Design a protein around this nucleic acid. Structure first.
Ligand SMILES: OC[C@H]1O[C@@](CO)(O[C@H]2O[C@H](CO)[C@@H](O)[C@H](O)[C@H]2O)[C@@H](O)[C@@H]1O
Ligand SMILES: [Mg+2]
Length: 580
DNA sequence: GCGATCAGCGCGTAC
DNA sequence: GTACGTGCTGATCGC
């Protein structure tokens, strides 16, 4: 049965009620400077469809959109807010975002459209977006009649689903998490994405020119050593050259053939000179394809800025994800890749990039939740945690800790945070399973509180069916009761890791909200550009650096109060690379 | 059967 | 452990 609604030719007063389900449809996946294909409003007076060209040109509608006292319920309001920002229109008063609500209730549903969220409450009087717009190469906006009914049905679902979703959130004690954390953060992310980050395109192009030369050279060297030409990027063609032709040892295999991962290649290097060249080729290729060419493809030619989109409703732990381009995985560990950061610069003259990062926030969070006396004392003394762990595991003084000892203790620490397992650590340190088990046993003898937490959290996950974070975010783990060892194993590791990774996410998210409030109170021009899980990147006039040096660390360190101190390091400079 | 497309995944970056 | 972009490739689409 068709849903009744008014296909409006002009905006009327009843469309401007102080409470409404609002749909501002942006079909393009990347909503930056994208078209708004239609608008739908559902309130106490009825259901309406408005053509964007009409509504967005109407002074009354635009004022209504920007009136904080006129409440709107939406699905993915950030998408609409940003699309509107590009049109110079402000969106205010969003009091409920169904996407964020669904995400908090259960990240595992993969809810990416109104229909998926509605299905959670037995509401199916709305079609999935893919059914209406199509998929891939056949994706397209349908004629007005079809488009109009779809947007109205989505607004109608939002209108009806608000109460049930808020009730369940309240039951889960997650209503504040939605209203005080995620929704306010959504607005901050919209500002960050809209602002974008300035790119020194000529610097990237220059790097691309040099890389192209080095690539060609290494490429020819590889063919000379292989005794023939082939597609070095082909797993089967490379696997044949290395393991069948050159007969190098097969140390590891994939599900479809031979493994050629970097760690495997490193072990084969001694056997043939072609190996080091392949590694070099891949190193150069990674930078060229993903960080040079890939980055240049998404830079806006008119402003030379990249505008990422922070997916706020995707990760199972509460973290954000970044796309087109992903600005959360720009190289930093190795100098060759780190240089890519010299290309990210301040958007204005006499401005600088300012970066602040939490020092070991996940291990500090673990110390707090596990209430492990030894670990808490270590952080209270602000000790080098990996050296400290080496001292405990190997039972030696600080001076007796060798570089290799610290390296292995470091790996144990990461394993503990990620959800420890003898098999896992054994692969990471290239040792036997029995040897890994010994490291783990030694670790738990030194950190009995951590051991207890790991045991208790897995049992809690089984009893309750989910695990939670400091701010009440939750993750269901049905596989915790799987009869398949491997499957259950993953679930147990997720039970151990989620509260840590997730609580770390809750903390930085609150820090972002607190920071923006302080920047505004202080009248600073400084503003957030990016968030990379445990760090925040801002840009501001050079005249604001000294104040930022005191303000940013304090806000981030005081976001929450834990049993151990929170520590934030910071640096600033002319480019992202220099903010080190 | 085959070119175009889609869908899975090895790989390598980040934290 | 949590992600994303990439290039290749087997599966599936569309003739
Ligand atoms: O607007 C981001 C928001 O939209 C979803 C779908 O509801 O993802 C879409 O947009 C992302 C950013 O462009 C794409 O990566 C994704 O492929 C596309 O479906 C949500 O997952 C996200 O929170
Ligand atoms: Mg750090």
């Amino acid at each position: 049965a068709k849903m009744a609604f008014t296909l409006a030719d002009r905006v009327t007063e009843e469309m401007l009620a102080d409470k409404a389900a609002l749909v501002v449809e942006v079909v393009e996946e990347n909503y930056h400077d994208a078209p708004i294909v239609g608008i739908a409003v559902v309130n106490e007076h009825g259901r309406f469809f408005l053509r964007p060209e009409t509504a967005l040109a109407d002074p009354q509608f635009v004022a209504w959109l920007g009136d904080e006292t006129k409440k709107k319920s939406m699905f993915d309001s950030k998408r609409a807010a940003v699309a509107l920002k590009w049109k110079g229109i402000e969106l205010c008063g969003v009091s409920f975002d169904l996407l964020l609500a669904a995400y908090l209730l259960d990240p595992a549903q993969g809810v990416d459209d109104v229909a998926a969220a509605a299905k959670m409450k037995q509401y199916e009087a709305v079609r999935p977006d893919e059914a209406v717009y199509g998929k891939g190469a056949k994706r397209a906006v349908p004629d007005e009649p079809v488009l109009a009914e779809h947007l109205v049905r989505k607004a109608a679902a939002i209108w009806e689903l608000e109460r049930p979703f808020l009730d369940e959130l309240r039951r889960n004690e997650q209503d504040r998490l939605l209203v005080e954390l995620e929704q306010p953060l959504s607005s901050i992310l919209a500002e960050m994405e809209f602002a974008g980050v300035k790119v020194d395109t000529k610097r990237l192009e220059q790097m691309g020119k040099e890389l192209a030369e080095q690539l060609g050279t290494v490429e020819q060297r590889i063919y000379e050593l292989a005794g023939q030409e082939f597609n070095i990027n082909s797993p089967k063609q490379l696997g044949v050259i290395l393991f069948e032709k050159l007969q190098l040892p097969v140390l590891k295999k994939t599900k479809t053939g031979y493994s050629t991962s970097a760690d495997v290649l490193e072990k084969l290097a001694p056997y043939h000179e072609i190996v080091e060249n392949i590694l070099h080729y891949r190193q150069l290729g990674k930078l060229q394809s993903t960080y040079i060419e890939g980055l240049l493809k998404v830079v806006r030619p008119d402003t030379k800025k990249v505008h990422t989109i922070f997916n706020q409703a995707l990760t199972q732990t509460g973290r954000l994800s970044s796309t087109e381009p992903n600005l959360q995985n720009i190289p930093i560990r190795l100098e060759e890749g780190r240089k890519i950061r010299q290309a990210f610069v301040p958007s204005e003259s006499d401005w600088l990039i300012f970066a602040a990062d939490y020092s070991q926030i996940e291990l500090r969070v673990l110390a707090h939740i596990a209430e492990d006396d030894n670990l808490m004392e270590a952080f209270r003394r602000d000790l080098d945690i990996h050296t400290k762990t080496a001292m405990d595991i190997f039972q030696v003084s600080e001076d007796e800790v060798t570089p290799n000892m610290r390296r292995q203790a470091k790996a144990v620490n990461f394993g503990i945070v990620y959800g420890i397992s003898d098999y896992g650590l054994a692969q990471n340190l290239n040792i036997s399973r029995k040897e890994a088990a010994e490291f783990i046993e030694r670790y738990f003898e030194s950190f009995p509180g951590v051991k207890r937490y790991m045991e208790n959290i897995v049992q809690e996950a089984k009893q309750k069916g989910y695990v939670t974070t400091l701010l009440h975010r939750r993750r269901y783990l049905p596989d915790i009761t799987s009869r398949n060892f491997n499957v259950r194993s993953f679930a147990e590791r997720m039970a151990m890791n989620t509260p840590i990774q997730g609580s770390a996410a809750d903390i930085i998210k609150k820090a972002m909200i607190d920071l923006n409030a302080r920047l505004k109170e202080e009248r600073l021009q400084a503003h957030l550009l990016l968030q990379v899980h445990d760090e925040l990147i801002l840009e501001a006039p050079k005249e604001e650096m000294e104040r930022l040096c005191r303000l940013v660390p304090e806000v981030m360190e005081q976001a929450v109060t834990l049993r151990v101190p929170l520590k934030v390091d910071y640096h600033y400079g002319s480019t992202w690379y220099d903010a080190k």
